[PDB]
Design a protein around this motif. Sequence first.
Motif, mmCIF file in Angstrom:
data_model
loop_
_atom_site.group_PDB
_atom_site.id
_atom_site.type_symbol
_atom_site.label_atom_id
_atom_site.label_comp_id
_atom_site.label_asym_id
_atom_site.label_seq_id
_atom_site.Cartn_x
_atom_site.Cartn_y
_atom_site.Cartn_z
ATOM 1 N N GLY A 57 0.794 -1.212 0.000
ATOM 2 C CA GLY A 57 0.000 0.000 0.000
ATOM 3 C C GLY A 57 0.838 1.279 0.000
ATOM 4 O O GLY A 57 0.301 2.353 0.188
ATOM 5 N N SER A 58 2.141 1.157 -0.257
ATOM 6 C CA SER A 58 3.065 2.282 -0.181
ATOM 7 C C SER A 58 2.896 3.206 -1.376
ATOM 8 O O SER A 58 2.884 2.745 -2.511
ATOM 9 N N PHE A 144 -3.114 5.456 -12.279
ATOM 10 C CA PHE A 144 -2.919 6.838 -12.659
ATOM 11 C C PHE A 144 -4.227 7.644 -12.566
ATOM 12 O O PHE A 144 -5.302 7.130 -12.820
ATOM 13 N N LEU A 145 -4.117 8.921 -12.244
ATOM 14 C CA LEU A 145 -5.251 9.831 -12.363
ATOM 15 C C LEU A 145 -4.772 11.137 -12.984
ATOM 16 O O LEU A 145 -3.885 11.846 -12.455
ATOM 17 N N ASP A 146 -5.372 11.464 -14.112
ATOM 18 C CA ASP A 146 -4.973 12.617 -14.902
ATOM 19 C C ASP A 146 -3.457 12.989 -14.895
ATOM 20 O O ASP A 146 -3.075 14.102 -14.602
ATOM 21 N N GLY A 147 -2.622 12.032 -15.261
ATOM 22 C CA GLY A 147 -1.221 12.254 -15.431
ATOM 23 C C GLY A 147 -0.308 11.848 -14.287
ATOM 24 O O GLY A 147 0.900 11.809 -14.453
ATOM 25 N N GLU A 148 -0.874 11.526 -13.144
ATOM 26 C CA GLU A 148 -0.070 11.350 -11.966
ATOM 27 C C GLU A 148 -0.394 10.018 -11.370
ATOM 28 O O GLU A 148 -1.490 9.511 -11.564
ATOM 29 N N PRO A 149 0.515 9.501 -10.536
ATOM 30 C CA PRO A 149 0.125 8.423 -9.662
ATOM 31 C C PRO A 149 -1.139 8.740 -8.958
ATOM 32 O O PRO A 149 -1.366 9.863 -8.509
ATOM 33 N N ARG A 150 -1.995 7.737 -8.903
ATOM 34 C CA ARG A 150 -3.281 7.848 -8.215
ATOM 35 C C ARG A 150 -3.060 8.212 -6.782
ATOM 36 O O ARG A 150 -2.044 7.830 -6.187
ATOM 37 N N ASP A 151 -3.967 8.983 -6.218
ATOM 38 C CA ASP A 151 -3.773 9.305 -4.800
ATOM 39 C C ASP A 151 -4.509 8.268 -3.911
ATOM 40 O O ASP A 151 -5.746 8.088 -3.988
ATOM 41 N N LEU A 152 -3.748 7.581 -3.059
ATOM 42 C CA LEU A 152 -4.328 6.442 -2.320
ATOM 43 C C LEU A 152 -5.416 6.795 -1.275
ATOM 44 O O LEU A 152 -6.214 5.923 -0.919
ATOM 45 N N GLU A 153 -5.494 8.067 -0.840
ATOM 46 C CA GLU A 153 -6.552 8.531 0.105
ATOM 47 C C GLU A 153 -7.650 9.302 -0.681
ATOM 48 O O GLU A 153 -8.808 9.092 -0.431
ATOM 49 N N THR A 154 -7.283 10.132 -1.674
ATOM 50 C CA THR A 154 -8.295 10.834 -2.548
ATOM 51 C C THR A 154 -9.195 9.829 -3.335
ATOM 52 O O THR A 154 -10.395 10.002 -3.404
ATOM 53 N N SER A 155 -8.610 8.777 -3.919
ATOM 54 C CA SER A 155 -9.385 7.791 -4.715
ATOM 55 C C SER A 155 -9.009 6.384 -4.278
ATOM 56 O O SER A 155 -8.238 5.701 -4.930
ATOM 57 N N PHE A 157 -8.372 2.539 -3.408
ATOM 58 C CA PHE A 157 -8.583 1.220 -4.045
ATOM 59 C C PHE A 157 -9.655 0.412 -3.359
ATOM 60 O O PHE A 157 -9.679 0.377 -2.124
ATOM 61 N N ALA A 158 -10.515 -0.259 -4.131
ATOM 62 C CA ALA A 158 -11.280 -1.402 -3.621
ATOM 63 C C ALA A 158 -10.374 -2.672 -3.534
ATOM 64 O O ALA A 158 -9.528 -2.868 -4.398
ATOM 65 N N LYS A 159 -10.563 -3.519 -2.504
ATOM 66 C CA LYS A 159 -9.801 -4.778 -2.299
ATOM 67 C C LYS A 159 -9.847 -5.600 -3.611
ATOM 68 O O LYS A 159 -8.849 -6.146 -4.035
ATOM 69 N N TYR A 164 -7.668 -7.275 -9.169
ATOM 70 C CA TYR A 164 -7.908 -7.092 -10.592
ATOM 71 C C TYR A 164 -6.593 -6.630 -11.234
ATOM 72 O O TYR A 164 -6.101 -7.252 -12.147
ATOM 73 N N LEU A 165 -5.993 -5.578 -10.674
ATOM 74 C CA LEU A 165 -4.707 -5.026 -11.094
ATOM 75 C C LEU A 165 -3.613 -6.102 -11.172
ATOM 76 O O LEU A 165 -2.808 -6.106 -12.114
ATOM 77 N N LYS A 166 -3.563 -6.987 -10.195
ATOM 78 C CA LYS A 166 -2.597 -8.089 -10.189
ATOM 79 C C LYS A 166 -2.870 -9.029 -11.364
ATOM 80 O O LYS A 166 -1.941 -9.404 -12.084
#
Length: 368
Positions: A57-58, A144-155, A157-159, A164-166
Motif C-alpha cells: 500500500g506504499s 494513474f489519475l490525470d497524469g499522476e500516480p493515483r492518490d491512495l486517500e483521494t481515490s 482502491f477497492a480490495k 484485478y490489477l494483479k
Amino acid sequence: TYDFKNLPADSGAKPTEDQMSAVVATFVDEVALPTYKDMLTKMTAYKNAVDKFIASGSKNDLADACDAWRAVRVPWEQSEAFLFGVADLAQLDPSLDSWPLDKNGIEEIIATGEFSKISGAVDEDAEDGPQNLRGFHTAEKMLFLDGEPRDLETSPFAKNELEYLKLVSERMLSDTQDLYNGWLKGLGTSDVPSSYAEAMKKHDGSAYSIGNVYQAIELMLNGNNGMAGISNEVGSAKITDPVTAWNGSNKDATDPNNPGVLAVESWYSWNSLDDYKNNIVSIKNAYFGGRDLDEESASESSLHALTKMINPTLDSLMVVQIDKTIDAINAIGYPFRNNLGDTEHINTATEACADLTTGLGVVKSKFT
Ligand SMILES: [Ca+2]
Ligand SMILES: [Ca+2]
Ligand SMILES: [Ca+2]
Ligand SMILES: [Ca+2]
Ligand SMILES: [Ca+2]
Ligand SMILES: [Ca+2]
Ligand SMILES: [Ca+2]
Ligand SMILES: [Ca+2]
Ligand SMILES: [Ca+2]
Ligand SMILES: [Cl-]
C-alpha cells in the motif's frame, strides 16, 4: 522541388537476393528480437513493481509501479511497425492493449469479483469481450489519475480492484512472454508452431507464408501491420479521431464525458504523445536497421541502404520525413488530452504521417 510522387529516375542498381536477405536478417536480430527482449525484461520489472505495491500500500511503491508501466510501454510502442507475426497471429496486440475499455464491465467486476470475465480469449465483436477488460489501459486506469500516480486517500482502491490489477499485470507478462518466445522459438500452438524469427530469416515458404525474400521485405513495409500501417494509424486514427470528436464537442477539457478527451489513448497517464513518437521511432529503427539508429549511424544491411542504392533522392526524402514526423509529433502541446485544439501543430503532425505513409508505399513498390 522533388517529393515522393515526383521522383527522379532510379539509379538502375537493383539489390540482389543475398542483399535483401541480410536486411531481413538484421531486422530480425537487431530490431525485432531485441525490442521484444527489452519488453520482456521491462515487463518482468513492471509485474514485480506492481506486486510490491499490492503487498504494501506504499505511495513510493505505487510511484515505482507507475514508472515501470511507462518504461515497459516504450518498447511495446517502439514495436508497432512490426505487428505482423506473433503479435497478429496469437492475438496479442488486442490482448495487451485494447482501447477503449468497457468501463461498465470493469466496475462490475470490481463489485462482484467475477475475475474469470477478464482472462478469456480475445473476442473483438462482444462489447464485454475479455480484451476490453484487461491490458495496458486497464492497469493504467487503476494506477494513474490525470497524469499522476493515483492518490491512495483521494481515490481509494477497492480490495477487489487490487486483485484485478494483479491479474491484469500477470496477463500482461504472460502475453509478453508469448510474444518474445513466439519469435525466438515458437509457442508450439496451432497459430504459432515454430520460430517466427527463423521463418522470416529463411523466407523459403516453410512457415507462415513467407515465401521468398521479396515477401519478407514487403512484410516489413506493409500497410496492414507493418511500417506503413503504423504511420497511417498514428496520423489518421490516433491523432485525427480524437480531434474530430473534440471538434464536434463542447470543447471543455475538464468535462469527464468529453468525447474528444475520452477517445485519446493513454490520457489516464498522459502518455499519448510519447506513444505516438515511439510508434514512429519503430519505423525509424526498422528503416535504419537498429534500435535508436539514424542516417548517420545506419546499418549497411538496412532498407535505408537499399533505398539509397535504388534512388538517393527517395532515400533522402525518407530520412527527412521520419525526422519531420517525429519533430511534428513532439511539437504538439502536452499533454495531448488538453491540447486537442492545438490546430496548427496537430495538422503539421497529421500531414507528416500521411506523407511518411506515401513515402513508405513508394519504397515498398521497389520490391513488388
Ligand atoms: Ca497502442
Ligand atoms: Ca493499438
Ligand atoms: Ca480500438
Ligand atoms: Ca465471437
Ligand atoms: Ca498536475
Ligand atoms: Ca499527486
Ligand atoms: Ca494523499
Ligand atoms: Ca506470402
Ligand atoms: Ca480516421
Ligand atoms: Cl500526452
